[PDB]
RNA sequence: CCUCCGCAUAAGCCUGCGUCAGAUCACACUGACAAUUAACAGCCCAAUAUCUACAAUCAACCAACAAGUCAUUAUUACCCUCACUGUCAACCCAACACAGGCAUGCUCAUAAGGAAAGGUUAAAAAAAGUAAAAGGAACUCGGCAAAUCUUACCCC
RNA sequence: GCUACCUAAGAACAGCUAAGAGCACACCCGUCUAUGUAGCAAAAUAGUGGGAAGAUUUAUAGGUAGAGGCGACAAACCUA
RNA sequence: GCUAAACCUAGCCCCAAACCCACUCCACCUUACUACCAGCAACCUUAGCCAAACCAUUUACAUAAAGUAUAGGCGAUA
C-alpha cells in the first residue's frame, strides 16, 4: 500500500496505489506428512521451495518471520511432531521407507515438548496453556484425610 | 421518553407489556390456543414441620451468655466426623447420581 | 462590594523554620567539595526540567521526548495540541 | 475572599474614622 | 448521613438533628483521636477550663467523633424549654460539652486529676493506670422473661449430631418425605 | 487567581469623593462619574 | 389461622412489648438442622406479624410499640441463614472442593473488562443455542484504547484521593 | 414543532442496547458512554 | 424463594421443595373496602398466586378459596434537594378470599 | 347559555384535582396514606413429508379488471391445566393549565360534555358583526371585500 | 418517530345526481381576504375556497444517509 | 432601613513516588437488567484545515555533534 507521484514527476500530482501479489492455486505433496495439500501459493514461495528443493525442508528451513503464514507455520509445526514422536505416516509395510523418509531430515527435528508450541498465536497459546492446567478442583476431605493417616503414622512410629 | 426511569411491564405498549413480566418465575409453559399448562413439579410446594411440642421461642433470654464465635470451617467438620476414621485405623466420588447436589445446586435455598 | 469587614487571622509565620533555617546549604557544593556533585543535582523537580532553564515552547518539547511515552493520552493530546499551536504563535504570529 | 491585608485594614480605618463622623464621643 | 456531616449533641436520626443538619446543608468541617481514648461515660473527671475550671463530675456522654465529654451538671449554660405559648415556659440549666484535653480522669485515692496510661499488667491484662500516682482506675458500668422467650436452658440445648447430609436431605428424612424420582442432567456451561 | 485587586474600592471612591455633589447617577455610578469629574476639573 | 399475622391481643395498645435478645451466631450454629428448619418457620411467622403491625402503624399515623423487635428479628434470619449457608458451604468443600455453588469463569465481555459471568443453567448444549452465540464474549483491538483511558480515569482518582489526604494530614499538624 | 411522535417500539429498534451492541460503532457510543460517567448509557 | 437460582425441570424429574422460604408476606387494612371473607396482602413481587394459595396453607393451615393479585406502581412524581426523582417502590398485592364460609374482619389495632 | 362536540379502544405518557395533614384572579403546590383484582387484551401452537386453478363486491343474474384478504392430508409424538403481565388519572406531541397536532369504534343533539361576560363605564383610534335614503362600480391596479348570483369571449 | 420515496400487513370514505364523472358530509389540502405578526402559533384563527371511490387519505412495523440518500426538478425534503 | 454585603474550607491544580481496577444473593447481548430448547463473525496508508502572504509538488507532530551533512515548486520550510 503506497502512493504514487503521477507519471514520476514530484510536480505532477500525488495519488495512492495497492500493489498486489499474482496469486495462484496449486497442489504441494510434502513427504512427512504423506498428503498433497492444495496452497495458494505465489510465483516467489514456487521459487523458494526449487531453491530448498523440497517443500518440507523450505517449510522447516524457512524463518518463522520470514514464511509469513499462519497455515505454513502450522505445517512447520506439524512436520517438527512427526520429526519428533517418530508416528507411523505410511503405516505398515513401509517402515524402511519411513526411516528414509526421517534420515532425509536429521537436521532440524527438535524435542517433542517444544515442537508442540511451535508456529502458535498468543491466544492459541494461552488457551493450550489453560487446557493443560485446568483440572477438577480435589477434594478439601480427601486431603484431609491423607493429613489424618500422616498424623497416624507419625503417633505409630513415636 | 425518560431513559432515567426503569424498563418494565407497565412501560411498553400492548405486545410490549405482555412479554415482560416481573421476577415471578414460571409456573409451565404455553401451547395450541395459548393454553397455559400448570405443571405440579415446577410449582415449589412448602415443606413446613410441625411446630407443636416445639420450645424454641423466636428471642432469647437475656440471661443468656455470650461465647467467642468460631467460622465453621470444613476443617472443624471433618474433625467432628474424625472418630470414625480414627476407629478405622462417608465420601462420594462423583455426586452426578443423587437427588440433592451440593455443587451445581438442585435444592432450592 | 468586593472589599471586606472582618480583617483576617494573623499570618503567623516562624521565619526559623528547619526548611528556612537551612535554605541553601549544600547549594555552592561543587566551588568547595573538589567538585564531585554539580549544583544542578542539588534540585529537586519533574525529571525533563532538571537543571535546564528552557522557555515555554521549548520545556513541552522536552516534556514530549522525556517523559510522553508514559503519559496520559488525555494529557499527551493536549500537549501536542499546546506544542502545534506554540510553533504556530511564535515561529508566525507576532512583531519582528 | 481575595489574598491581601493592607486594604482591608484601609477599610476598617475608613468604617471606623466614618463611625466617629456619625455617633461622636463627649 | 452525607460526608462532611457535623455532629451534633443530639442523636443523628432525631427531629432535632434533622432540624438543624438536613441533607441539603454544607457546613465547615471540624479539625480534631486514636483508638487510645481513656475517657468513659460514668467516669469522674475534673474540669480544667472554662466556666466552672476546677470543679469535679460525673461524665453523662461521650461523643468521641467530636472529641467531647458531657460533664452531668456541670458547664452549664440555661435552655427554657416548652414555652410555644407566650409565656416563659420552662427554665433548665444545659450541659455544654468538653473538648478532651480540658477534662482529667480523677483519682480514686487522691481525688487529684491526672494523666493516664494503657498498661498490660500481670492479671491478664489490658486496663488504665496512673501515670502519677499508682493502681488501676478501673471502668464505669434483673430481667424476668417473656412468652415468645426460650430460657438459657432451651437455647443452649445444642443438639447438633455432625453428619455430611446437609440440612435438606436430613430434615426429609425426618419428615418421611420420600422421592423415588431422579434429577435429569442439565448443561450449566 | 494570582494576584488581583483588593484596593479597588479605594480608586471608585476617589473619583466619587469629587463627583458627590453631582445630579443623578453621575453621583453614584462610578463609570458616569469619572467622565463628568475629569471634563470638571 | 390469621390471627397469627397479629401478636397477642393483650399486648394491642401498650406503647412498649417486651421482647428479649435476638439469635446470636454460636448459639445457632450449636442448633441441629431439623432443628433450625423448625426455628426458621417460627421466625417467618413472628416477622410477618411485625410486618403487617408496622403496615398498619403506619395507616394509623401513630408511631410503632417496638420497632427494635423487628430488627432483631431480621437479625436472627440474617444468622440463621449464614449458619446454614456457612454449613452448606463446608459440605461441597468436604465432597467436591468447590467455592460457591453456582459455577462462572471469569469471562472478559466486549467492554473487555473481566465479568465473572455466572453460567444459567438449560437443556440444550451452548454450540446449538441460538441466543447464546450471539452473546459474545471477546473484545476487538477499538475496546483496548477504551480500557486504557478508563484506567487512567481510575489512576487520576486514586492520585486526587492520595494528595487529599496527604493536605488533611499537614492541616492537622498545623492546628496541632 | 411537534417532529417527535413516540413510540416505544421504534425507539428501543432504533436506539436501543441491543442495536447499539449490533455494529462497532454502537458498541463505542456504549464505551464513549461509559467513559464520560453517564447514567444512561443506551436507550 | 425470592432472589435464588431455580433448578431445572426437564421433563420427568422430582418436585421442587423449598426449605427455608426468602419471601414474606403481611395482611393489611383494604382502604376500599372489600366485602366479608377476602383478606388482602402485600406481597413481594416474585410470589405467584400459587405460590400465596400454598404459603398460607402449609406455614398458616388456612384454607384459601381464590386468590387475586396485582401489581401496584409506586409513585415517582418526587424530588429532592437535587431534583432527583425519587422513586416509591412498585409492589405486589393480593385479594384472598377465604374458604367455607371462614370469614374475618381486620382487628383493631392500636385501640 | 353554549355543545365545530362526547363516551370508549389504539398509541402515548406514567400516579399528574382519591382521604387526611400542611403551608403560601382567589385557596390541581409539599408530606403521609390509600389505590388498578380477569372473563377483555397481551403472552401461542412437536415432527417429517404431502396439499391449496376457480376473488372481493347483501354474491344470485348481469359485469368485468387493476386479477385479489380467511383450507388441508398421511404417519409418528403426546394427559399437565388457567400461571405471568396491562388494567389509576383531569393524560399524549407541540418549552406553558399553549385557539395548533392526534389513528379507530360508537353517539350525530346528545341520556354525554362545557361556560363566551373580575367589577364599572360606554370616549377616540382599532377589531368583528348588523343598518341603511337616492344612486348604484362612479371605488380601485383589478368589483379586492361584501350580497345576489350567474352572460358571453380571449390567452396559456 | 418530521418530511422525501418505497416494502409488509390493516383501515376510512355519509347523503343526493349519474366514469382517475358532478354536487356535497366526514377526512385531505391550502385560492383570496381580514386578523395575528415576543401571536392561541418559531406559520395560527375567522371566513372564502381546491379535492373528497382515488395518480385518494391514513394508523402500525420496516428500508434508503450525506463525496450520499430521496425527488410527478420545485436544486424540493432528509426531525424549527 | 430594605435589598443586600461580607466570611474558609469543600475540594481542586501541578509535581514526586508507586504499575492499577474489577463475583453479599438475583439480573443483565431477546425490547439489557428478561429463569427454561437445534448457526454469520476482527484486522485494509489517514485527511484537511493550515504555511507557502493565491495554489496545484510540498508544510515538523538527558546534553553535545547541530540546526551540521542532506532534502526541497532547491522555498516555505524539513
Ligand atoms: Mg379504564
Ligand atoms: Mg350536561
Ligand atoms: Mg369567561
Ligand atoms: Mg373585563
Ligand atoms: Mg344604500
Ligand atoms: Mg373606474
Ligand atoms: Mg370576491
Ligand atoms: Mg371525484
Ligand atoms: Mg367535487
Ligand atoms: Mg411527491
Ligand atoms: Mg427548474
Ligand atoms: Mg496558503
Ligand atoms: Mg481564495
Not at chain 1, 526411516?99 to 517433542?112: G, H, L, N, W
Not at chain 1, 493450550?128 to 480427601?142: A, C, I, M, N, S
Not at chain 9, 384454607?63 to 396485582?70: D, E, G, I, L, Q
Request: hydrophobic share 35%; aromatic share 10%; proline share 6%.
Amino acid at each position: 500500500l503506497g502512493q504514487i507521484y503521477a507519471n514520476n514527476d514530484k510536480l505532477s500530482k500525488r495519488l495512492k496505489k495497492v500493489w498486489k501479489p499474482q496469486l495462484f492455486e496449486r497442489e504441494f505433496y510434502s513427504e512427512i506428512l504423506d498428503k498433497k495439500f492444495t496452497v495458494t501459493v505465489t510465483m516467489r514461495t514456487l521459487d523458494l521451495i526449487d531453491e530448498a528443493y523440497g517443500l518440507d525442508f523450505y517449510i522447516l528451513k524457512a524463518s518463522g518471520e520470514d514464511l509469513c503464514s499462519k497455515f505454513g507455520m502450522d505445517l512447520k509445526r506439524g512436520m517438527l511432531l512427526r520429526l519428533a514422536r517418530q508416528d507411523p505416516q505410511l503405516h505398515p509395510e513401509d517402515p524402511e521407507r519411513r526411516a528414509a523418509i526421517y534420515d532425509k531430515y536429521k537436521e532440524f527435528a527438535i524435542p517433542e515438548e517444544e515442537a508442540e508450541w511451535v508456529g502458535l498465536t498468543l491466544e492459541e497459546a494461552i488457551e493450550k496453556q489453560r487446557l493443560l492446567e485446568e483440572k477438577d478442583p480435589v477434594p478439601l476431605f480427601k486431603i484431609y484425610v491423607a493429613e489424618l493417616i500422616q498424623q497416624l503414622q507419625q503417633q505409630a512410629l513415636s | 421518553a425518560d431513559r432515567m426511569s426503569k424498563w418494565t411491564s407497565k412501560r411498553g405498549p400492548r405486545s410490549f407489556r405482555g412479554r415482560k413480566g416481573r421476577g415471578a418465575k414460571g409456573i409451565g409453559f404455553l401451547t395450541s390456543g395459548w393454553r397455559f399448562v400448570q405443571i405440579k413439579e415446577m410449582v415449589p410446594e412448602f415443606v413446613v414441620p410441625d411446630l407443636t411440642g416445639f420450645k424454641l421461642k423466636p428471642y432469647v433470654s437475656y440471661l443468656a451468655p455470650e461465647s467467642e464465635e468460631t467460622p465453621l470451617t470444613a476443617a472443624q467438620l471433618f474433625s467432628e466426623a474424625v472418630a470414625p476414621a480414627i476407629e478405622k485405623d462417608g465420601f462420594e466420588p462423583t455426586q452426578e447420581g443423587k437427588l440433592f447436589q451440593l455443587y451445581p445446586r438442585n435444592f432450592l435455598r | 462590594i468586593g472589599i471586606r469587614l472582618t480583617l483576617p487571622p494573623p499570618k503567623v509565620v516562624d521565619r526559623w523554620n528547619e526548611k528556612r533555617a537551612m535554605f541553601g546549604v549544600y547549594d555552592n557544593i561543587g566551588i568547595l567539595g573538589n567538585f564531585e556533585k554539580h549544583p544542578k543535582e542539588l534540585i529537586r523537580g519533574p525529571i525533563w526540567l532538571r537543571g535546564w532553564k528552557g522557555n515555554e515552547l521549548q520545556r513541552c518539547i522536552r516534556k514530549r521526548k522525556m517523559v510522553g511515552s508514559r503519559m496520559f493520552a488525555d494529557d499527551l493530546h493536549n500537549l501536542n495540541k499546546r506544542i502545534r499551536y506554540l510553533y504556530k504563535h511564535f515561529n508566525r504570529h507576532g512583531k519582528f | 475572599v481575595k489574598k491581601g491585608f493592607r486594604a482591608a485594614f484601609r477599610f476598617q480605618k475608613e468604617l471606623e474614622r466614618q463611625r466617629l463622623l456619625r455617633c461622636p464621643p463627649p | 448521613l452525607p460526608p462532611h456531616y457535623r455532629y451534633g449533641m443530639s442523636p443523628p436520626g432525631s427531629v432535632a438533628d434533622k432540624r438543624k443538619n438536613p441533607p441539603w446543608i454544607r457546613r465547615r468541617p471540624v479539625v480534631v483521636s486514636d483508638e487510645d481514648w481513656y475517657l468513659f461515660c460514668g467516669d469522674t473527671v475534673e474540669i480544667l477550663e472554662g466556666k466552672d475550671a476546677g470543679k469535679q463530675g460525673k461524665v453523662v456522654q461521650v461523643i468521641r467523633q467530636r472529641n467531647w465529654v458531657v460533664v452531668g451538671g456541670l458547664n452549664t449554660h440555661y435552655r427554657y424549654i416548652g414555652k410555644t405559648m407566650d409565656y416563659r415556659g420552662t427554665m433548665i440549666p444545659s450541659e455544654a460539652p468538653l473538648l478532651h484535653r480540658q477534662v482529667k480522669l480523677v483519682d480514686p485515692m487522691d481525688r487529684k486529676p491526672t494523666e493516664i496510661e494503657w498498661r498490660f499488667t500481670e492479671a491478664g491484662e489490658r486496663v488504665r493506670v496512673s501515670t502519677r500516682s499508682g493502681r488501676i482506675i478501673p471502668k464505669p458500668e434483673t430481667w424476668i422473661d417473656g412468652p415468645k422467650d426460650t430460657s438459657v436452658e432451651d437455647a443452649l440445648e445444642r443438639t447438633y449430631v455432625p453428619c455430611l447430609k446437609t440440612l435438606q436431605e436430613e430434615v426429609m428424612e425426618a419428615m418421611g418425605i420420600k422421592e423415588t424420582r431422579k434429577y435429569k442432567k442439565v448443561y450449566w456451561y | 487567581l494570582r494576584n488581583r485587586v483588593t484596593d479597588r474600592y479605594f480608586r471608585i471612591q476617589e473619583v466619587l469623593k469629587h463627583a458627590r455633589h453631582f445630579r443623578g447617577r453621575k453621583n453614584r455610578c462610578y463609570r458616569l462619574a469619572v467622565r463628568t469629574v475629569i471634563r470638571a476639573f | 389461622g390469621l390471627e397469627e399475622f397479629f401478636d397477642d391481643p393483650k399486648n394491642w395498645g401498650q406503647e412498649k412489648v417486651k421482647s428479649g435478645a435476638a439469635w446470636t451466631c454460636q448459639q445457632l450454629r450449636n442448633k441441629s438442622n431439623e432443628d433450625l428448619h423448625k426455628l426458621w418457620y417460627v421466625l417467618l411467622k413472628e416477622r410477618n406479624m411485625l410486618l403487617t403491625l408496622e403496615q398498619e402503624a403506619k395507616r394509623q399515623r401513630l408511631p410503632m410499640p417496638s420497632p427494635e423487635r423487628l430488627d432483631k428479628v431480621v437479625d436472627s434470619m440474617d444468622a440463621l441463614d449464614k449458619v446454614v449457608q456457612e454449613r452448606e458451604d463446608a459440605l461441597r468443600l468436604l465432597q467436591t472442593g468447590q467455592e460457591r455453588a453456582r459455577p462462572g469463569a471469569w469471562r472478559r465481555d466486549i467492554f473487555g473488562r473481566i465479568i465473572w459471568h455466572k453460567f444459567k443453567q438449560w437443556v440444550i448444549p451452548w454450540h446449538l443455542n441460538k441466543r447464546y452465540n450471539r452473546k459474545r464474549f471477546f473484545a476487538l483491538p477499538y475496546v483496548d484504547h477504551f480500557l486504557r483511558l478508563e484506567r487512567e480515569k481510575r489512576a487520576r482518582i486514586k492520585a486526587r484521593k492520595e494528595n487529599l489526604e496527604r493536605k488533611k494530614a499537614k492541616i492537622l499538624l498545623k492546628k496541632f | 414543532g411537534n417532529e417527535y411522535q413516540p413510540s416505544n417500539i421504534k425507539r428501543k429498534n432504533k436506539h436501543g442496547w441491543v442495536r447499539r451492541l449490533s455494529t462497532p460503532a454502537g458498541v463505542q457510543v456504549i464505551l464513549r458512554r461509559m467513559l464520560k460517567g453517564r447514567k444512561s448509557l443506551s436507550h | 424463594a425470592r432472589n435464588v437460582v431455580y433448578p431445572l425441570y426437564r421433563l420427568g424429574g422430582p418436585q421442587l421443595r423449598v426449605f427455608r422460604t426468602n419471601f414474606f408476606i403481611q395482611l393489611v387494612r383494604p382502604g376500599v373496602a372489600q366485602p366479608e371473607d377476602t383478606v388482602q396482602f402485600r406481597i413481594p413481587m416474585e410470589m405467584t398466586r400459587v405460590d400465596l394459595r400454598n404459603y398460607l396453607e402449609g406455614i398458616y393451615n388456612v384454607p384459601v378459596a381464590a386468590v387475586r393479585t396485582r401489581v401496584q406502581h409506586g409513585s415517582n412524581k418526587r424530588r429532592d434537594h437535587r431534583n432527583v426523582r425519587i422513586k416509591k417502590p412498585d409492589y405486589k398485592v393480593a385479594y384472598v378470599q377465604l374458604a367455607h364460609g371462614q370469614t374475618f374482619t381486620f382487628p383493631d389495632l392500636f385501640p
